[PDB]
Amino acid sequence: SDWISFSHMSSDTDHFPIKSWFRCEQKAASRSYRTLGDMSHPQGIYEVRAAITRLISLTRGVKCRPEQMIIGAGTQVLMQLLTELLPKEAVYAMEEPGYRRMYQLLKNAGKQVKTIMLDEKGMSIAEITRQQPDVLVTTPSHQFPSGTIMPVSRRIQLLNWAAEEPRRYIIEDDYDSEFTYDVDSIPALQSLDRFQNVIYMGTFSKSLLPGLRISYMVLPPELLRAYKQRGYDLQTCSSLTQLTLQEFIESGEYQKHIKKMKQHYKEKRERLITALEAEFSGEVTVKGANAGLHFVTEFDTRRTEQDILSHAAGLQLEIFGMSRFNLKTGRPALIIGFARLKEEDIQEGVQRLFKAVYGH
Amino acid sequence: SDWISFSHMSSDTDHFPIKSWFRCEQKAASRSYRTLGDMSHPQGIYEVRAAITRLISLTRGVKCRPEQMIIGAGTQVLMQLLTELLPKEAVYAMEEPGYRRMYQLLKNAGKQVKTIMLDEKGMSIAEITRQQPDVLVTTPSHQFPSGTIMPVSRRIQLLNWAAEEPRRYIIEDDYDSEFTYDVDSIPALQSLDRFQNVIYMGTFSKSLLPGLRISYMVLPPELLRAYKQRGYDLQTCSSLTQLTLQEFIESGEYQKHIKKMKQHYKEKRERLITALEAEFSGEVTVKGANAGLHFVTEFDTRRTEQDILSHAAGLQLEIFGMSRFNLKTGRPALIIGFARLKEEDIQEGVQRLFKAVYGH
């Protein structure tokens, strides 16, 4: 496999400190071995929840007490639980383009899902208003996949909407929030909300490995009450995994990791854009590269997206199409993730793109 | 600080080879690091599924491919998924006494659950006939908590019932199946399943640790088709955990540990029963002491079950009554779980019990 990954779903393992993670695991195991034979508090070990709460209040400005947070074997399990905590009759609203997987999860749940188009400011509040939903699912920090950062003004608009009527909720998926390059950090929607209409959700898939399977959500106390009233849920994250995370955070290894990785990803995104402009001369349009670990490139060709993809897979370039993120064509648009893209493989990689874009 | 536990819920941390597990973890990691930035296959990494499939076909006669198996961070998320694969209008049935947690999950989902009492051969097929459910939840190998082992005749009656009408299924929870001591083990129900009515669910929580969170389920092809039709699921079980378990199995460490713990518990259960018959003069009756990590004792008293339990909290002896396992009285019976009972605490424990019942 002499592959090159322009994939957004992967993360580069060479710069994760796996020995540090493993040493954090051993520290946690020896500090807490006696209590490992317990099954965690269903919301997650309290001290781990406390570590995450301090962490996210620091980095993102999130305001919560650890009692509000639930862990977490992935955002998909948390989101399922969340649909059971929300009113059963709620009408959901997701960004178009967006996460088809959650769209299918919601439809499969018999829910009504309205797809909300985007504009230069993020998910379209005008379409939200026209279609009149109950629950919004949004990616304000770095829209997925379009990469649009939602400006504060649009955030204000969404919060005003949520607050003008009862039992309206905003699910803020703060995927990709650890990295914000030549823009500065904008605080989360939750931190701008005065009325607790926001379910903040975050994950460690990108700040760590995806195979580690940990995410978390912060409930409004009304939904938290609805949670506690269940009485039968069990934690899906292994206790050691929770404790290794808590050590990794509290040792300062996580902040060290993130700082170094931000510098690394900033430089790699500059290099990739420069290679893209050299190879494609300015016949590629790049969009949504302000933050996060991916951007969009639209090209222009008489090749269908599907045949471009079929031909990039032959050159062993791993890359995906924007058409994948339709929930519910006109030009080729592609998603370029530079998480796993090796820094020595840029030119070669971009070359494999030109030949897959064109044929030469 | 001087507690003695006759709990089933307990799990040996002391005689769990955590160093062997950690060495299997690092071996798996050096061999498979570059795939830890990848997301697992949603059913689970194929090779972990194959390792488990070979294991369970050996130890329990289970007939399946890895293609049919789903993992699995605990048996409850597998259960929830399962209720989604099964017809939305299914009527469930659970043993009484049984697992109140699942009863609670099923009811909180809006499902009608029937409770089905036991007779000498296990789940009462006469009551299943009478109350007319669609889906059975059963523990044929060692009924929880009664210790009753369902004989082949009753298994065939259950299979026949499921064969006679559409949309009838049997969930076989092989929760306690790693330890069956001085009775030659019966094969799983699943091994008798000619018409593919049985969903087999097993777990490693009992056989390694509860906090480790790894369980699995074997789906009949129609249900597997139902699952692949979803197309949105993601593996909840940490890829690291999956790989560590595959190394643990294939290095032969799992089989070593199980042979050792099996022998340990055989000898401990025999010693415990010896001590019981010595101290209680034949005014104790022991039921289902053949396998698993528990059995049932019935005594003589004036005291409410709450009285024996209450007086045992004052001898610092943790124990459970059969009325705990109603899915919602007329005498006391208790369940003795020798899982984390220390071998030096047997005689003392039984001594405490004789006073806990009486107070002489």
Closest residue by Cα to residue B142 from B186, B111, B109? B186
**CATH code matching the domain that covers B4-14+255-357, chosen among 2.160.10.10, 3.30.565.10, 3.90.1150.10, 3.40.50.150:** 3.90.1150.10
**For an interface test with A, which of B234, B241, B244 has the most A Cβ atoms less than 10 Å from its Cβ?**
B234
Strands A92-96 and A113-119: parallel
CB-count exposure of residue A211 (10 Å: 0-12, 13-18, 19+): buried
> What angle (nearest 5°) sits at the alpha carbon of residue B69, between those of residues B67 and B74?
155
Q: Where are the alpha helices (H) located in B109-238, listed in sequence order?
A: 125-131, 152-164, 221-230
Classified as helix, coil or strand, B99 is coil
What are the tokens at A41? Answer: 């508090």
- Point out which residues pair with A321 in neighbouring strands: A334
Among the listed residues B64, B67, B128, B55, the one whose alpha carbon sits nearest the alpha carbon of residue B93:
B128
- Residues spanned by CATH 3.40.640.10 within chain B? 38-251
Provide the shortest C-alpha distance from residue B160 to chain A (in Å): 32
CB spacing of A238 vs B211 below 8 angstroms: yes
Partners of residue A82 in chain B, C-beta under 8 Å: none
Q: Which helix (H) or strand (E) holds B173?
A: strand B169-174
Lookup: tokens for A181: 């390059």
**Beta-carbon separation of B13 and A33 below 8 A:** yes
Resolution of the deposited coordinates, in angstroms? 1.9
- Which of B107, B108, B82, B64 lies closest to B169, judged by CA? B82
The greatest distance separating any two alpha carbons of chain B, rounded to the nearest whole angstrom, comes to 65
Q: Best of B8, B35, B39, B107 to disrupt the A interface by mutation (most A CBs within 10 Å)?
A: B39
For B91, which DSSP code?
A: P
What is the spatial distance between Cα B309 and Cα B320, in angstroms, rounded to a whole number?
A: 7
Q: Does A33 sit within 8 Å of B101, measured CB to CB? A: no
Distance in angstroms (rounded) separating the CA atoms of residues B339 and B179: 11
Q: Which residues of B touch A37 (CB under 8 A)?
A: 10-13, 209-211, 340
Place of tokens 């969404």: A158
Buried b (16+ CB within 10 A) or exposed e, A256-265: ebeeebeeeb
Report the C-alpha gap between B136 and B123 in whole angstroms. 9
Picking from A10, A211, A236, the nearest residue to B240 by CB comes out as A211
3-state secondary structure chain A: CCCEECCCCCCCHHHCCHHHHHHHHHHHHHHHHHHHHCCCCCCCCHHHHHHHHHHHHHHHCCCCCHHHEEEECCHHHHHHHHHHHCCCCCCEEEEECCCHHHHHHHHHCCCCEEEEEEECCEECHHHHHHHCCCEEEECCCCCCCCCCCCCHHHHHHHHHHHHHCCCCEEEEECCCCCCECCCCCCCCHHHHCCCCCEEEEEECCCCCCHHHCCEEEECCHHHHHHHHCCCCCCCCCCHHHHHHHHHHHHCCHHHHHHHHHHHHHHHHHHHHHHHHHHHHCCCCEEECCCECCEEEEECCCCCCHHHHHHHHHHCCEECEEHHHHCCCCCCCEEEEECCCCCHHHHHHHHHHHHHHHCCC
Select A34-252's CATH number: 3.60.10.10, 3.40.50.720, 3.30.1330.40, 3.40.640.10.
Answer: 3.40.640.10
Q: How many CB atoms lie within 10 A of CB A342?
A: 14
Contact B160, B197 (CB under 8 A): no
Dihedral sign for Cα atoms in the order A122, A211, A74, A205: negative
How far apart are alpha carbons B170 and B161 in whole angstroms? 10
Determine the straight-line distance between the first and last CA of chain B, rounded to whole angstroms. 23
Burial of A232 (C-beta count, 10 Å sphere; 0-12/13-18/19+): middle
- Nearest Cβ partner for B212 among A18, A231, A238: A238
Q: Which of residues 205-234 of A touch B (CB under 8 A)?
A: 209-213, 230-234
User: Is B39 an 8 Å CB contact of chain A?
Assistant: yes
A&B contacts, CB < 8 Å: 116
User: How far apart, in whole angstroms, are the C-alpha atoms of residue B77 and residue A261?
Assistant: 34
- Is residue B103 classed as helix, strand or coil in its secondary structure? helix
Calculate how close chain B gets to A210, using CA atoms only, in Å: 6
Residues whose CB is less than 8 angstroms from the CB of residue A43 and which lie 6 or more positions away in sequence, other chains included:
A49, A67, A69, A70, A71, A227, A235
Determine the Cα–Cα distance for residues B231 and A149; give it in Å rounded to an integer. Answer: 29
Q: Is B107 on the interface with A (CB under 8 A)?
A: no
Give whole-number Cα distances, A108 to A328, B73, B223, B233, B271, in Å: 14, 22, 16, 11, 53
What angle (nearest 5°) sits at the alpha carbon of residue A251, between those of residues A247 and A256? 120
CB proximity B241 to A under 8 Å: yes
Compute the Cα dihedral for B83, B89, B94, B100 and give only its sign.
positive
Specify the DSSP element, H or E, that contains B246. Answer: helix B239-250
**Cis, peptide link before residue A133, omega less than 30° from 0:** no
- Stated length of chain A: 360
User: Which chain A residues touch B77 with a CB distance below 8 Å?
Assistant: 73, 77, 236
One-character DSSP codes across B12-81: -STTS-HHHHHHHHHHHHHHHGGGSSSPPPTT--HHHHHHHHHHHHHHH-----GGGEEEESSHHHHHHH
Nearest to A201 by CA among A246, A137, A147: A137
Instruction: List Cα–Cα distances, A107 to A132, B50, B230, B331, in angstroms.
Output: 18, 32, 10, 50
Q: Any chain B CB within 8 A of the CB of A324?
A: no
Among B159, B114, B171, B121, CA closest to B143: B121
- Rg of chain B over Cα atoms, rounded to whole angstroms, equals 21
Residue B343's Cβ-side half-sphere holds a number of Cα atoms within 13 Å equal to: 10
**Residue B342: count of CB within 10 angstroms of its CB:** 14
Two tokens, residue B247: 């190394």
Cα torsion A321, A325, A326, A330 to 10°: value is -30
The pairing of strands A92-96 and A135-138 is parallel
Nearest to B38 among A74, A100, A211 (CB): A211
Measured CA to CA, the distance from residue B19 to residue B16 in angstroms comes to 9
Environment class of residue A126 by beta-carbon count within 10 Å: exposed (0-12), middle (13-18) or buried (19+)?
Answer: exposed
Instruction: Check: CB of residue B217 under 8 Å from CB of residue B69.
Output: yes
Experimentally, the structure was elucidated by X-ray
> Distance from A138 to chain B by nearest Cα, in Å?
19
Residue type for B227, please? Y
| Number of neighbouring beta carbons within 10 Å of residue B22 | 15
**Chain CA centroid to CA A223, Å:** 22
Whole-angstrom distance, CA of residue B261 vs CA of residue B281: 30
Q: How far apart are CA A129 and CA A125, in angstroms?
A: 6
B232 to A108: CB separation less than 8 angstroms, yes or no: yes
Q: Is B38 on the interface with A (CB under 8 A)?
A: yes
φ/ψ of A134, rounded to 5, equals: -105, -45
What residue type is assigned to position A252 of the chain? G
Indicate the helix (H) or strand (E) that contains B253.
helix B253-280
The reply to whether A196 touches chain B by the CB within 8 Å rule is no
Residue ranges, comma separated, of all CATH 3.40.640.10 domains in chain A are 34-252
- Tell me which chain A residue has its CA closest to the CA of residue B209: A37
Q: How many residues does chain B have?
A: 360
Q: CB B76 to CB A234 under 8 A? A: yes
- Residue B74 sits at the vertex; the CA angle it makes with B68 and B79, to the nearest 5 degrees, is 60
Give the integer Cα–Cα distance in Å for B330 and B300. 13
Give span(s): CATH 3.90.1150.10, chain A: 4-14+255-357
Which residue has tokens 């955590």? B18
Residues whose CB falls within 8 Å of the CB of residue B151, separated by 6 or more in sequence, listed in order: B121, B122, B186
Neighboring chain B residues of A76 at a CB cutoff of 8 Å: 232-234
CA A43 from centroid of its chain's CA atoms:
21
**DSSP bridge partners of A95:** A116
- Supply φ then ψ for residue A275, to 5 degrees: -65, -35
Question: Which amino acid is present at B273?
Answer: I
What DSSP string runs through B136-153?
Answer: EEE--SS-TTT-PPPPHH
- Record: fold of B38-251: Aspartate Aminotransferase; domain 2 (3.40.640)
For residues B3 and B315, is the Cβ–Cβ distance under 8 A? no
- Are the C-beta atoms of A248 and A92 separated by less than 8 Å? no
What is the C-alpha separation between A22 and B26, in angstroms, rounded?
9
Phi, psi of A324 (to 5 degrees): -65, -30
Helix or strand run (H / E) with residue B105: helix B100-108
Which residues of chain B does A40 touch, with a Cβ-Cβ cutoff of 8 Å?
211
- Give, for B354, the enclosing helix (H) or strand (E): helix B346-357
Neighbouring CB atoms inside 10 A of B83's CB total 19
CA distances from B39 to A110, A238, A240, A265 (A): 27, 18, 20, 21
Does B211 sit within 8 Å of A239, measured CB to CB? yes
Instruction: Give the pairing type, strands B92-96 and B113-119.
Output: parallel
Where is chain A broken, named by the residue before each break, C–N > 2.5 Å? 328
Tokens representing residue A274 in the block = 């420069």
Q: Is B332 helix (H, G, I), strand (E, B) or coil?
A: coil
C-alpha–C-alpha distance, residues B304 and B316, integer Å: 18
Residue A309, Cβ neighbours under 10 Å: how many? 20
Alpha-carbon distance of A110 to A88, in angstroms, equals 10
Which of helix, strand or coil describes residue B195?
Answer: coil
- Interior/surface letters A132-151, b for 16+ CB within 10 angstroms, e for the rest: ebbbbbbbbbbbbbbbbbbe
Burial of A344 (0-12, 13-18, 19+ CB in 10 A): exposed
Beta strand pairing status for A317-318 and A4-5? Answer: parallel
Considering only CB atoms, A209 lies closest to which of B37, B73, B101, namely: B37
Nearest residue on chain B to A45, alpha-carbon basis: B211
